[PDB]
Design a protein around this ligand. Structure first.
Ligand SMILES: *[C@@H]1O[C@H](CO)[C@@H](O)[C@H](O)[C@H]1NC(C)=O
Ligand SMILES: *[C@@H]1O[C@H](CO)[C@@H](O)[C@H](O)[C@H]1NC(C)=O
Ligand SMILES: *[C@@H]1O[C@H](CO)[C@@H](O)[C@H](O)[C@H]1NC(C)=O
Lengths: 495, 495, 495
């Protein structure tokens, strides 16, 4: 005979959530925060295309391997794409000193302008056209690196070369040259006649006199000789001088470094698509709305933080209890707008009014706890691409263990935070429904019988508007004091 | 006159446990998870012995220093043991280029097969037997590295050598050679006659022409001359060519790399024992049943995770309160099977029945919380052995700071987890005993007086089987409604 | 008519504190733990001054660039200060091999003693005074590095040099020498006459024969020639031998390494002040009383742990609620010594007595939780100074990413701990005031009416000393049993 109940929300949700102590708990509202799909393509970064080297490697492109395409337009890029094992590199076999350190410098570089420092037609005293090879073909012919000039003896003499370029520009200059290492002393004379030659080069900060290491080697790409290349950055206002009496592989073209910034060299086997992203990975681009992904560790752009987990979901509301009577027995499918509320049961009432003011105290402190934990990972470890030669293995592994180390550390930090605050989310829900109960029972005191299912029966009487009397905190015990006590002492001596 | 009490377990345990806020709290059940003893021996890893180099270093073994023993059987190993300062290395003094990079490659290597590429008896045009030294003795005689051939002028001439080996095998080949650096120009001619010689060597990817650096040096192991060694890996189907006019230290034997995998070079001063482990450390092996140890950071095998702590113990049950009456006053030594229960006190009852269904709801969620926190460290940072030469100090310290850095990070992660979930374990125990109380008081309502020690006295009466009426959740208030109220209004007007 | 209330402290505090779920909560007592001011000066470390190189670089000092000052006193230092771009280095242009590895060795070094190994006046067979240059001026004259001797042909001959130094000392010796690289073959003969010369040097472990790389270069500091320097550490009982026929830049002075320990090279643009600290950073010293700072990551000394946060404050007491009646309504400005207490309201009482025994159970477990969380970061990652040449960029970035990585990791660990234990601090306060309430209501049972504001009215009566009866846990219900029940059944049938 006349009731009021404390209860909480329940709905059709089946999304599940974990804590430290429980797995797979059905909750009423949750929020996935792990991105796990990608679009499988290479795309532009916010309107800036990558440089897709195709089957060419970085050396192939910079040296001008005849099978590689130059970028005459001087386009800026957002990153650079190189296949894992590019097929078009040093078509003429050899080595490329500090190649990896250079590939690294590329990673902070967004735009080149190729310029001419020594035109091919200016080597008056030597042969600048016979320097081609079956190893570097072009349309079936013998050709050569398009940016360096293989210099050959003219009419049986190699006059000593001394040429200098003064960097009048304001940008750094990337300059590449090399030296030729023949098979045998016959070939040395056949090509440069001087039996004993050097390639010397000087700047403010660079000092190197290179000599030819004649030796007998197996044939790569048809050649048993070798060409070894060098590089350096000529600073603004500085100058560079090459002196050679032979074997010199001369620069024609240098690269003006005209834009630096966030960039990268991505190893990927994919080609281009009409496509834009904010976050790009080697196997595809990412819809960067979630704060965490597990697609690939080497993502670049404005990206979610990478974590090694199959799932990462935060709890937002109650557990999903149908559930009857008061809150002791579970949730109310019949309460729709609010997480915690009550239920009119008078001689005319229907029920199910929510306590707006502790549900928007709730949806306030959880919506604020959600961003506060995301931002807690703003400074999470983003991994960076880097390469290493076959005698840099210790530092490669070092680099690999430090990037795995942090990925594991932040994977754990994120799993634990979600698990911990998920437990703190559900326990919070258990606290407000119990504290809702307590405000009404510290209101209705003697005047009301508390049933232990989560509901109260009144010894006095209360219409619809005395039910708002107790829902508001506005209830007045003396406004029914005398009535109520007169009506339970009648049960004390009742039936 | 007639009672029932809520209470919890208490026993003879004295194992202690810590939380964030308290130290040294006596608990009823706990679980150590830190392994801190080792067996003090070098053992096999799961049936696969290590390679114990004894007083020999890795170069000593690979070069065949006469005092080192070859491994003619070609045994596979689980790891390699090298004393800290091995005594048998380059018995003939010198250097060993990229030694550390090679020791590193050994760490991913489990089996060699030594093979012959250039037999000593095939150097028809030079002396292959006079090349021995008092620096490399064998049975008191002068001997030499057993795997390289010191080549000497024959009958006063050193014909130019050009020999090539074609790697017809399917495995990688480790090949070692060297060059001799004499004291003075007299000795250069005394041994090789050509005053100006080189050691050239080529592969697909290797190009090096080495020249002798004659200089005056102090005598190591009786010699003031030096031998400098080189190494390289000859790929399957590739070939290698040495050309020398003198000073060449020639390979006889190469190492077929026939098994790669998890391996390591352990620095340890211990010798072998008839002994097997699953986890091996430089100072001894570990009984790998616990998920954490503190024995040594450089453990290899299926190992617990290393942490810098003297202790790591998780709480499993209650605090250990003797403790009297209801739960307000502490635990019941008298309750044996269950963590939470009650106590029959009727006109014939004895007491102490456990609530099976919230104790195996308890021993369920703690046993599940224990493995869930162990596995939370599956991806914990395992450290790796690595070495560095005396001009690689910056990267040595880098490597040392990154491995300490992660050990400190995961030591903290583990101490905090245990401390935090230990507090969440004990607070949980406090929640079920209080919630056990609440189910019975929301059952027995008016019909019962609640004492505040944790017990209830009944205004009606209840036999043994009405005590199971309230222990089951099966109690019926109207089944004693009228009786009980009639019997406290008799106390309202009682004595 | 006659009352007692449960309540808690409230005061004039406005210091604010955050948790996982709330920001900016006003608390009654807190504790800042983040140091964020510095004194802006370079100071001594605990009585040991730094070595302030001023405008000179480390090479400038060690080589004796005429513009640098030697440290004749051989002072020990606590660290070394070098401006970012020092102006006084290789006044004679060139390179300094493994410079960074040497700067690193300095970081574990606290005291040099310069000693003489080859006095300038002992080069009887060559010119030891003409070796000066307009590039290395001193008082406007031409001078030279004060610690090496530029050796010149004597009277048109350069006799081959063979000199050796035997390290009879017990300390390690730092030894520096170099070689001269002329512009052209004329200058080579003009200075050393031998057209083909070397600089050879040997120790137990060092073997290097250096040759001059003549090339045409741009002029630095007026010179287009180059001097290239080398260094090595001569061990106790070992000896070193230089052999040259020219271009040798000879050591005069070596550095006895006489004290090693904690040291560093600090990059700072500041000069010295009459000043001592326990913790020094490049932009100033720190009052090292707090356990965390955010002043600069490269602090040295007994220092707080560096974290990237604008604020780090722990909660110590209650939230700051004026707040009326019992605890339901907030704090009591009127309670001064204790965090939790009560309030005499009898027919003569005043009120406000604190429960000493659960407030010093409180100020005990929070003061113990404060140090326990500080010490939890004893093993926090301290960063270390290190440098890298322009072809060591990959390992520079590696080093930078690993030191940022740990700073981010420990910044997060510390923000989360403070936020988490701040929530555990306030919830604890909410637990004791509610449990204080429960001890008194489990004491005064029937004999007392519980109002729901946090207070109780007595059906019996209780003077001042029956209020200590209930504050002590010493209350006796039968000592007012009969009285109280007789006096609420009078209200049951009352007005
Ligand atoms: C799930 O419940 C919501 C109300 O909470 C309702 O609007 C929606 O249509 C329901 N969906 C299904 C499939 O039942
Ligand atoms: C400790 O208590 C257990 C029962 O919980 C009992 O079986 C065991 O014998 C006791 N041991 C000692 C030494 O008292
Ligand atoms: C703040 O309160 C303390 C007592 O808690 C008092 O001693 C102090 O004088 C007060 N300060 C101000 C500025 O009101």
């Amino acid at each position: 005979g006349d009731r009021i109940c404390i209860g909480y929300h329940a709905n059709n949700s089946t999304t599940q959530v974990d804590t430290i102590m429980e797995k797979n708990v059905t909750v009423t509202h949750a929020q996935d925060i792990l991105e796990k799909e990608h679009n499988g393509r290479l795309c532009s970064l916010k309107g800036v295309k990558p440089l897709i080297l195709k089957n060419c490697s970085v050396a192939g492109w910079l040296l001008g391997n005849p099978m590689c395409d130059e970028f005459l337009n001087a386009p800026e890029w957002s990153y650079i794409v190189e296949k894992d094992r590019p097929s078009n590199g040093l078509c003429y076999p050899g080595t490329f000193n500090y190649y990896e350190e250079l590939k690294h410098l590329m990673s902070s570089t967004n735009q080149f302008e190729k310029i001419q420092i020594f035109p091919r037609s200016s080597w008056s005293n030597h042969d600048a056209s016979s320097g081609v090879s079956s190893a570097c073909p072009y349309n079936g012919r013998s050709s050569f690196f398009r940016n360096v000039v293989w210099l050959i003896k003219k009419n049986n003499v190699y006059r000593t070369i001394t040429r200098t370029y003064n960097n009048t520009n304001i940008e750094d200059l990337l300059i590449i040259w090399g030296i030729h290492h023949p098979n045998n002393a016959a070939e040395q004379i056949k090509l440069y006649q001087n039996p004993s030659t050097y390639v010397s080069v000087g700047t403010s900060t660079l000092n190197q006199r290179s000599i030819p290491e004649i030796a007998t080697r197996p044939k790569v790409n048809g050649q048993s000789s070798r060409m070894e290349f060098f590089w350096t950055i000529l600073r603004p206002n500085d100058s560079i001088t090459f002196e050679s009496t032979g074997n010199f592989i001369a620069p024609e073209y240098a690269y003006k470094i005209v834009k630096k910034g966030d960039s990268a060299i991505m190893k990927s086997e994919l080609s281009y698509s009409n496509c834009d992203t904010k976050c790009q990975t080697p196997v595809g681009a990412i819809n960067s709305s979630m704060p965490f992904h597990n697609v690939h560790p080497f993502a670049i752009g404005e990206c979610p933080k990478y974590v090694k987990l199959k799932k990462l979901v935060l709890a937002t509301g109650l557990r999903n209890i149908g559930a009857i009577a008061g809150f002791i027995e579970g949730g109310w499918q019949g309460m729709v707008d609010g997480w915690y509320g009550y239920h009119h049961s008078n001689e005319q009432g229907s029920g199910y009014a929510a306590d707006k003011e502790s549900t928007q105290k709730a949806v306030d402190g959880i919506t604020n706890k959600v961003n506060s934990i995301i931002s807690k990972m703003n400074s999470q470890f983003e991994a960076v691409g880097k390469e290493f030669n076959n005698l840099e293995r210790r530092i490669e592994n070092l680099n690999k263990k430090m990037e795995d180390g942090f990925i594991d550390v932040w994977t754990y930090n994120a799993e634990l935070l979600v698990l911990m605050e998920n437990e703190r989310t559900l326990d919070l829900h258990d606290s407000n429904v119990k504290n809702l109960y307590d405000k009404v029972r510290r209101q209705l005191r003697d005047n009301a019988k508390e049933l232990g299912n989560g509901c109260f029966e009144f010894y006095h009487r209360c219409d619809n508007k005395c039910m708002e009397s107790v829902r508001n905190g506005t209830y007045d015990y003396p406004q029914y004091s005398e009535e109520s006590r007169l009506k339970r002492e009648e049960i004390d001596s009742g039936l």
